[PDB]
Nucleic acid binder design. Structure first.
Lengths: 277, 277
DNA sequence: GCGTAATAC
DNA sequence: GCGTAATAC
């Protein structure tokens, strides 16, 4: 059906400033099978300054050896669930050394599934996240609302002291333009009133801006996730669940927020952010 | 390799008393696939007064309709994990109505996985259990030891007021005769020193007697579980993990403790107990 | 429900 | 590790 071709990368700030930092985020949905699907040859080409991975499904002991073979991303940090083995998990790889690296959001109820790494750098503080899925039948919908409130107060406090960049799978399509089939999904995980109101309260509270919508407020059919079933990806029946939210003070540095719709290895695709620090 | 033919059923007490009650236990390892594997036609033939199922892997909402089509086992009771969906789970079906039915062992740490049903009858109190597996690599070995102590104090208190029958997957081979390959499994879940000492402390504390060993103290190669891998069952490379433990006062009623080595539908086989109440 | 990656045992 | 039954998403 309908198509989307991501525009060419703009590497120049609105004030003419050239791009310094290139961040990349990707929900790999199985880091080991992603590695097996030649996913790591792709990021070697993208050459990002920072790499954020979500849904690694891989305890820190089982990490493949080819991760230690990325000559430009040697500082690697991982978070994993306390108990469950092939579930959730996030990772943050960096070309430069972070000043401080912290894990989780400071409330033990939400820190048992390895969902958040916080990497503080010189000019800003990066946060990569993998928000809990409300799940089919919406069993975790009530829990998800408790998470969103505590995650918002956690982010609001970080931005209080330093410019903030949130990134990763946020497991919500903000608006009707952010998914292919809006009407039939008002009662499904990812496009419920409560999840969408929560994303809205996030932008308003810390505060943050959706990078992609700030540069392309009216671009439709631009998705980051496609269900493996029903040939969803070949038909571009997708969802935009992967984001880059910036502090308002960082918008003069924003050069481009990209969506690599063609990169394989996962039921998500990578997203890239160009900043000028 | 070596073989085992379960002897014919003895339905007469040592004191000449005839059999009243016929209990049956079976770790079905997937109640729905077990039903699909014609497992329920088997128990219709066995015609037991009570049926105990372990590792149902089936929440109470997803129970098949053919369970309500057992005309001789209409009183059905189920336990399931609080959160995990296709994991653990035990069930107790009965021809007669129990006086009281309780769930779990009275300590919330061990009651979140649906492992114990307690059914009090007129002459005795039946308990069916599915003991936590220490797991490959023995991650739950320390937890398993905490369970065994609390499960023993729970059983010791039940037998304090009524004769007791424990049954189900106890996830331990007591002695070297209770598994095919004793030497190579001293460091594996099911035949560790700690698990075996725990089973021993159980028999001594409440107290209880292994029905099968009381009637066949020297019968080897008699297993209830066979790994699905390595063609373990066709080679009788097995483990005796499924038991019937009685209060000492009930031994004059014991007629026979059986092992149906030939019944399919699971990587465990059913066990049957004949009592004369 | 259906595709895929990981599980416990 | 390998067979099988169930998972989350």
């Amino acid at each position: 059906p309908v198509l989307y071709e991501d525009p060419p990368d703009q590497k120049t700030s609105p004030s003419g400033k050239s791009a310094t930092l290139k961040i990349c985020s990707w929900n790999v949905d199985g880091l080991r099978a992603w590695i097996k699907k030649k996913g790591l040859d792709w990021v070697k080409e993208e050459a990002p300054d920072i790499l954020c991975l979500q849904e690694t499904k891989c305890s820190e002991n089982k990490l493949p050896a080819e991760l230690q073979e990325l000559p430009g991303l040697t500082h690697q940090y991982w978070s994993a669930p306390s108990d469950k083995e092939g579930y959730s998990g996030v990772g943050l790889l960096s070309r430069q050394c972070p000043l401080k690296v912290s894990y989780g959001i400071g409330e033990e109820e939400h820190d048992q599934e390895g969902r958040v790494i916080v990497a503080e750098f010189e000019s800003f503080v990066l946060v990569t996240a993998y928000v809990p899925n409300a799940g089919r039948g919406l069993v975790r919908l009530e829990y998800r609302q408790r998470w969103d409130e505590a995650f918002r107060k956690f982010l609001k406090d970080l931005a209080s002291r330093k410019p903030l960049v949130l990134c990763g799978d946020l497991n919500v399509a903000h608006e009707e333009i952010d998914l292919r089939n809006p009407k039939g999904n008002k009662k499904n995980a990812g496009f419920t009133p409560q999840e969408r109101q929560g994303f809205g309260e996030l932008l308003q509270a810390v505060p943050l801006a959706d990078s992609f919508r700030h540069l392309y407020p009216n671009t439709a059919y631009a998705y980051t996730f496609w269900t493996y079933m029903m040939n969803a990806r070949s038909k571009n029946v997708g969802w935009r669940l992967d984001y880059f939210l910036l502090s308002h003070s960082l918008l003069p540095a924003l050069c481009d927020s990209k969506i690599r719709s063609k990169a394989l290895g996962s039921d998500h695709c990578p997203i890239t952010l160009y900043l000028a620090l």
